[PDB]
Design a protein around this ligand. Structure first.
Ligand SMILES: Cc1cc2nc3c(=O)[nH]c(=O)nc-3n(C[C@H](O)[C@H](O)[C@H](O)COP(=O)(O)OP(=O)(O)OC[C@H]3O[C@@H](n4cnc5c(N)ncnc54)[C@H](O)[C@@H]3O)c2cc1C
Ligand SMILES: Cc1cc2nc3c(=O)[nH]c(=O)nc-3n(C[C@H](O)[C@H](O)[C@H](O)COP(=O)(O)OP(=O)(O)OC[C@H]3O[C@@H](n4cnc5c(N)ncnc54)[C@H](O)[C@@H]3O)c2cc1C
Lengths: 499, 494
């Protein structure tokens, strides 16, 4: 009945669909478990109708990002604003000291930069002589260059350098040192509606292809030459080619016990060892977001990029200055509970400077993400948890402590203080169809394995797409976008030529 | 007749000095170090100015401190003796335009950010891609502005190209004379300003026999007697015989050997003449002209926010318009040809505010070719030099919170006392600053031909003879250790 069956309506699947149609292919489906398309691309609506991407937000690597370039071309022709370049000079804030960025005496940006070259040198042409954690790597550096670092640099640099946790959605003790640093192919463009991208692509093929709320439970590959696919409601579709775009975290269920897990797909035959071993190669991080909606901007718009540093100690400096080796240090750190807003770095996007909106989009990482998404409906607790970083920010930005206005209550002498009107939090680590943000690396991981395993397919019939099945743009919206065109063309020409 | 020697080293720069040090280290004797100037150090020279203030008029920094074998050694000493030999002086750059004043870390221009994107663009352009032609740095920037114009503001298109040019002060070349392929190179970590590089020179010089050193002897020729012997002739008539010789004269001096006329100061006559691999290599690598000008002030009466300051060369909104309307690089080159004298604003200038990094109320300024040649040529006319750098000097004071500079070369106003100027381009045993690439140059040819010697006995060392640390003091050093080690080993097999 069906030529190709695309599982998942994220951008990978939506692209694969747009293409198949672009190549005259007919009778193809798109089975999406959620009741909406977009997958990890979702724009929501808050106070006074403001819109925010709770999922993906940027076009990364604008110098090579092909999806972005398509968008740029569209904007050249119709003048419609689709994105904005929000790269800015980062403001770094420490609870006690305050702003530690562009410091005439701390010069953290320079050492961080060195820190970066050091890491490159440690793994350059070595085959990864034992991979450690970003945390360990940072320690090695501090030890090896202390003779050339002041006290304040040994104390703060490691905290500032953790902003990289918000790029992987992983804390520095869980993240791989070998993958921490990666290529940044040019500036980033804040998408002004990734939902426009999702919207455009979904409307580039027969709407009657989309089947929302279709949980796919099992995929069968009868050597006969067809592929049996059964959604959850008991329906069944027969197809020649199948493009599975579910997320790595989800797919990683097909290789475990308990087939009653939400989303899990039963494969018949079972995924060859290559694929199943790929999963031991690690994956899935947990980048999260909290949107803070204020009545109006009443703070300085010096920068659109603000990062709060996790608390540090002079007791740390002393331990670096006295350790005699990695072992004595790796141990002398036996020094030392209660997670607070100052227990990890937090990345704040000041939307006022960049998009004229009085809100802040904050990014968070594991293990914090899952705990905060857990209390997403408890506005009061969320406000109490972040109130201190928020006020520290407002202070540093020539403003005042935040007033809680989420409950409809109007006052007048508060037109000079920032009034918080609402909080929106993501829910990716708890949504069964995502179970996390995107692929990431634990010390010892190796992405190539999975990319190859995935791009080589289960066979000539069962293929794969998604931010986890490609090398360029891995984990990014465009990476997923291209992986969708890939499998799509590999099946397309393989049909036009047929007959 | 000619005194016998095991090894003869030509040149007492850091290369020859280290090569000799290594030799005396591996127990070799009857060696000689022939140097044309009345001093050792070569391109490393510390001079004296107002009040006894000292400055390096040649090399100043230890580059790539994460892997600099020379630096590491220096830092090891300071770990014991506890004395200060250097100071990490990297800092956030302050960029100054004539009209607009400071343009660094500006929330609207974000120049440093687009600058970062441009180098990435350059990396994506040549890295991994074979066959791509070379072109000039200037051409590379124009191409970038062309391809990314839809994503840049008018002021970025205007100021970025001028901000990118600080790289001219890393090569000693104007962006039109500089090879795009060689413009960007890795920096293995922070830089360390040596507080007197002469202390490095001295320490190495004193690590071997004094009698080994012969200053003021200008070597004029080297000959290979096809039978384990090399003849060297100082101009003072003396003649020496050696088993080995390590030639360390600058690439620019050595270049004089492949041309007819033996009466040029520094030129060495080779018999047999240098092999064609060596000769032909001079066509694929050239020489840069980085220069220095020291501005000594009475006292420091200016802001010490940073020790790094770069004055941008003038730009015009007309340029932005041309970039906006150009159809391609072809039309842009055409429109750009929109045609008077050279001023302190005709090219970027790089100033080191020594006040902040050393406490000394002076400015160390770097310049590039062609400006360096014109400035060093009139380096004796102190009045003309002040009139030249006055507008720019003032502007700095303004941006740094102070008044115009006062000429005091004979309360809250900065008073200029002395102006020192480098002389590397006019010096016969220098003839320029250091190895550099014009578009098309393949530096590997020279490095290969050099480290493989003229033959088993005629060897070469110097900053232009090695890959890692090429053009650097520590590379010259390593090349010195290289040649000496090889020889020791050979002289060890008796
Ligand atoms: C907080 C956060 C921020 C991010 N920010 C950025 C950014 O700034 N820039 C960037 O480039 N990328 C960003 N990303 C990553 C980007 O969102 C993803 O790479 C991309 O959306 C993945 O697309 P996909 O099509 O592969 O998968 P989705 O993850 O799009 O998966 C496709 C669909 O599969 C469906 N599905 C799953 N299981 C089943 C099943 N059993 N049956 C049927 N359907 C099923 C899902 O419900 C989903 O809709 C971010 C991600 C997160 C979580
Ligand atoms: C203005 C300027 C700034 C610089 N700044 C830096 C910096 O910040 N950091 C850095 O790492 N590098 C810097 N350099 C480069 C550094 O100075 C050189 O890499 C290094 O000093 C070259 O050493 P060398 O031993 O090869 O040659 P020298 O240049 O050491 O040459 C060797 C010797 O040969 C002698 N000689 C020449 N001809 C004859 C002859 N016929 N007979 C006898 N002797 C002869 C010369 O007098 C000279 O002393 C700078 C150079 C210049 C010009």
């Amino acid at each position: 009945k069906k030529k190709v069956i695309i599982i998942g309506a994220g951008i990978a699947g939506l692209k694969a669909a747009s293409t198949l149609h672009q190549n005259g292919i007919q009778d193809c489906l798109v089975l999406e478990a959620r009741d909406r398309v977009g997958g990890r691309l979702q724009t929501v609506t808050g106070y006074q109708g403001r819109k925010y991407d709770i999922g993906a937000s940027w076009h990364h690597d604008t110098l090579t990002n092909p999806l972005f370039l398509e968008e740029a071309q569209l904007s050249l022709n119709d003048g419609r604003t689709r994105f904005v370049f929000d790269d800015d000079n980062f403001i770094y804030i420490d609870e006690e000291r305050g702003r530690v960025d562009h410091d005439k005496e701390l010069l953290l940006e320079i050492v961080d930069n060195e820190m970066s070259k050091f890491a490159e040198l440690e793994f350059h042409q070595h085959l990864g002589v034992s991979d450690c954690s970003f945390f360990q790597l940072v320690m090695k550096y501090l030890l090896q260059r202390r003779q050339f670092l002041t006290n304040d640099q040994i104390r703060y640099l490691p905290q500032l350098c953790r902003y990289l946790e918000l790029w992987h959605g992983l804390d520095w003790k869980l993240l791989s040192a070998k993958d921490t640093y990666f290529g940044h192919q040019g500036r980033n463009a804040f998408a002004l509606n990734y939902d426009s991208v999702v919207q455009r692509i979904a409307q580039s093929f027969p709407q009657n292809w989309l089947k929302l709320s279709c949980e796919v439970k099992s995929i069968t590959r009868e050597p006969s030459k067809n592929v049996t696919v059964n959604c959850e409601d008991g329906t069944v579709y027969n197809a020649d080619y199948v493009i599975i775009t579910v997320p790595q975290s989800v797919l990683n269920l097909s290789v475990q016990p308990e087939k009653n897990l939400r989303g899990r797909i039963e494969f018949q035959p079972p995924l060859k060892p290559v694929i199943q071993d790929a999963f031991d190669k690690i994956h899935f991080g947990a980048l999260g977001k909290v949107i803070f909606e204020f009545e109006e901007c009443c703070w300085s718009n010096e920068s659109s990029k603000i990062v709060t540093l996790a608390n540090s100690t002079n007791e740390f400096v002393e331990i670096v200055r006295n350790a005699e080796n990695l072992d004595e240090l790796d141990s002398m750190l036996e020094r030392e509970t209660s997670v607070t807003c100052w227990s990890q770095p937090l990345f704040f996007v000041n939307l006022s400077k960049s998009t004229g909106v009085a809100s802040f989009m904050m990014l968070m990482q594991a293990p914090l993400t899952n705990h905060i998404e857990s209390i997403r409906e408890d506005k009061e607790r969320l406000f109490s948890f972040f109130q201190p970083v928020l006020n520290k920010i407002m202070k540093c930005l020539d403003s005042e402590d935040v007033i809680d206005g989420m409950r409809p209550i109007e006052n007048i002498a508060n037109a000079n203080k920032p009034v918080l009107r609402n909080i929106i939090v993501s829910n990716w680590t708890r949504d069964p169809y995502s179970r996390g943000a995107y692929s990431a690396c634990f010390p010892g991981d190796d992405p190539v394995d999975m990319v190859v395993a995935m791009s080589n397919g289960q066979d000539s019939r069962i293929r794969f797409a998604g931010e986890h099945t490609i090398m360029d743009g891995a984990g990014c919206a465009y990476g997923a976008w291209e992986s969708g065109r890939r499998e799509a063309t590999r099946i397309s020409d393989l049909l036009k030529l047929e007959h």
